């Protein structure tokens, strides 16, 4: 079964300048990856834990 479309969305820090540790699926490296989210205007490719990211988007690389 094909994965959700969110796995294809880009990393989006957004405009806000908070420090919110999150995870996103990097479609270039093919792995769930930590990033610092700003706190507003994010997309669906934005998870609170590594497992939550991996459950939606499994490693390809």
């Amino acid at each position: 079964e094909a994965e959700a479309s969110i796995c294809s969305e880009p990393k989006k820090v957004g405009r806000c300048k908070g420090y919110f540790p999150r995870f996103y699926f990097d479609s270039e490296t093919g792995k769930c990856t930590p990033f610092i989210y700003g706190g507003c205007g994010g997309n669906g490719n934005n998870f609170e834990t590594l497992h939550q990211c991996r459950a939606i988007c499994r490693a390809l690389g």
């Binding site: 820090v13 405009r15 806000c16 300048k17 908070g18 420090y19 919110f20 540790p21 610092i36 700003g38 706190g39 507003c40 205007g41």
Partner: protein, 223 residues
Amino acid sequence: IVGGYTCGANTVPYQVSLNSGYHFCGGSLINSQWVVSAAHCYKSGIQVRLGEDNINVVEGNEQFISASKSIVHPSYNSNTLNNDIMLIKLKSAASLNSRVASISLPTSCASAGTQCLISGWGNTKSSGTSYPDVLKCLKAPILSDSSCKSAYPGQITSNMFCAGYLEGGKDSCQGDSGGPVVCSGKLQGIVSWGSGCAQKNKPGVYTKVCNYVSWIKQTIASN
């Protein structure tokens, strides 16, 4: 803070750290029991850390105080970031000393060209991961409303101002949100947003504190 300098221990005694098991936003002490921050920094069970320099090392002179109330502006809009301001009441009044002190609120709005001090523990680079241990500082001028709107078409409200440098290289960044912009000894701005950090023609955008002084006074008076 990108392109700034090490403030020096406790040289910005109104600067606080908001902590949720880690530093996530800054804030400003405006009286012994109240802190001003950004609405997008709202969390439950916030611990306010006062008198900090090195956020990663226990010095012994810090004060940790739990938030008892956190109140965002009733007109805050998370999509446009209009009214990006929040008040945090401390469970107990902070002990005031040379390391923990309140910053005054303005009676009038500051003018373009005024040099201000912006501070925080945010990213010190415009990409990657370059987070400081100690508090960073930046001197930056308020930019004209016209240049702010040109930099961010259709995004600047009457409750925002730009400050910084159109050439890039010097700005606030992720981790600085909620922190102070102080001009002539008055809290004129709150670190809010921008397109990235320290990018050409993309200066930092700040909540216009002079527009909220009356709301602050009444909120304190009713809580």
